[PDB]
């Protein structure tokens, strides 16, 4: 301290003691949803960029008329991450991980993961090396993180009822009668007397001749393709907060693919609704 420092200084002599006065693998994610199976398909795609194209004839092989790279990949890893945790995710079909690649190549790996308001966090790692000269190799471990970001059930307008085919997709030989179990969910206030019917009449057309005849052929195939063996059925009662199965019976006469078949429409005898319940069907008769 100041005392401990000034108590051992050297006083000036002859004076008083005191005084007073004074990048070649550009990659992309184009993930897409699939509400049918309830998944999201994330597909990475990495290709040799134009940088490699212009770099081929500069240092790699200037004197050769046409050269090409020897990109060898040792790891194409797709990983799902949340916080500190990470788990590898396998692809749909096999991908030989010690794969070779040359110039102007493009590769994709497709990954299926399950799908509201909880975006995922994914990481892609590409460990590879370009083989220049017979045995000289330079390793690269580029990687980066990102986030996975981007009908059969038919509802009734001006109501709360709900319709769904138990087996919305069925295939059967032509001329064999088949059965479809139409489920009805009713929870609004009260029962109903809805009646289901298939009309085998050609809807009048409203367009060039090509489009006009395409429309007529579509309507004809709809009209006289399938026949409902319980036409003008009376679904007896659907009490509130309860479900019911309408056991519909059909038989096909004209081979084709009746995806989202029209004509089958259910009439509600309370407000004259004409809901197109038949959109939840994918009949395929050979």
């Amino acid at each position: 301290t100041l005392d401990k420092y000034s108590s051992e200084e050297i006083l000036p002599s002859f004076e008083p003691v005191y005084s007073w006065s004074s990048s070649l693998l550009n990659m992309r994610l184009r993930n897409i949803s699939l509400k049918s199976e309830h998944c999201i398909l994330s597909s990475l795609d990495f290709q040799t960029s134009k940088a490699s194209e212009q770099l081929t004839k500069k240092f790699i092989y200037p004197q050769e008329h046409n050269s090409f790279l020897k990109l060898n990949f040792q790891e194409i890893s797709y990983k799902l991450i949340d916080g500190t945790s990470q788990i590898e995710l396998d692809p749909i079909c096999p991908l030989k991980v010690p794969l070779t690649a040359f110039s102007y190549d493009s590769i994709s790996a497709t990954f299926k993961l399950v799908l509201s308001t909880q975006p995922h966090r994914v990481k892609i790692t590409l460990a590879y090396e370009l083989e220049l000269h017979p045995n000289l190799k330079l390793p690269v471990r580029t990687s980066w993180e990102t986030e996975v970001t981007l009908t059969s059930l038919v509802n009734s307008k001006l109501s709360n009822v709900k319709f769904k085919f138990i087996n919305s997709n069925i295939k059967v030989i032509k001329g064999e009668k088949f059965t479809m179990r139409l489920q009805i969910i009713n929870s609004s206030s009260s029962p109903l007397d809805l009646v289901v019917y298939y009309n085998n009449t050609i809807n009048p057309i409203p367009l060039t001749l090509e489009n006009q005849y395409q429309l007529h052929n579509k309507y004809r195939k709809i009209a006289e393709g399938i026949i409902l063996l319980s036409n003008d059925y009376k679904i007896p009662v659907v009490p509130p907060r309860e479900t019911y199965f309408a056991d519909l019976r059909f038989i096909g006469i004209m081979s084709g693919y009746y995806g989202t078949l029209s004509g089958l429409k259910v009439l509600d005898l309370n407000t004259n609704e004409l809901i197109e319940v038949g959109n939840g069907a994918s009949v395929l008769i050979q």
């Binding site: 799902l80 991450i81 949340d82 500190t84 945790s85 990470q86 788990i87 399950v114 059930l153 709900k162 769904k164 489920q183 969910i185 479900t243 019911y244 199965f245």
Partner: peptide
């Protein structure tokens, strides 16, 4: 269909329940 079914009071049925452990650790 959102956990709803009809039973005919005497018939016995079965179905599959699908779950996943969403945790990663």
């Amino acid at each position: 269909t959102r956990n709803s079914w009809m039973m005919l009071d005497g018939t016995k049925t079965d179905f599959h329940i699908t779950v996943r452990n969403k945790s990663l650790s």
